[PDB]
Symmetry: C2
Subunit: 73 residues, 2 copies
């Protein structure tokens, strides 16, 4: 139940073998994340700062509780 990574379109867009596991392709932890109760402006600022489009949202124990994307904005 621990957030171990994140796998997006850039990771899979050139992989010819579609039978590979996620572990070989994913971006492993640590990640750029935000805590629970993050506002829209804070998430947008983080995304603009780190030049990313996704933002996992974790609790105080480091467990995954939410996800934010640029698609929302």
């Amino acid at each position: 139940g621990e957030l171990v990574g994140i796998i997006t379109n850039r990771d899979m867009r050139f992989e010819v073998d579609q039978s590979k596991p996620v572990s070989e392709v994913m971006t492993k932890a640590p990640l750029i994340t935000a805590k629970e109760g993050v506002s829209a402006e804070a998430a947008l600022g983080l995304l603009r700062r780190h030049k990313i489009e996704k933002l996992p949202i974790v609790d105080g124990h480091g467990k995954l509780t939410g996800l934010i994307t640029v698609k929302d904005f």
Copy 2:
């Protein structure tokens, strides 16, 4: 005439003020580049390794000569 940076869609996609200069928004050098005469395989390997969609090509003296993009592939 020096290759001082690169500016892409991620840099500009949340800049409300369109009158800003390029320098205030661009990604400054050094950049992930390749040498002249780089094959398609090497360029694709660089793009996959660094998770980027562009690749400037400079000469032996560091002056910009060309560009490679994922659009080509």
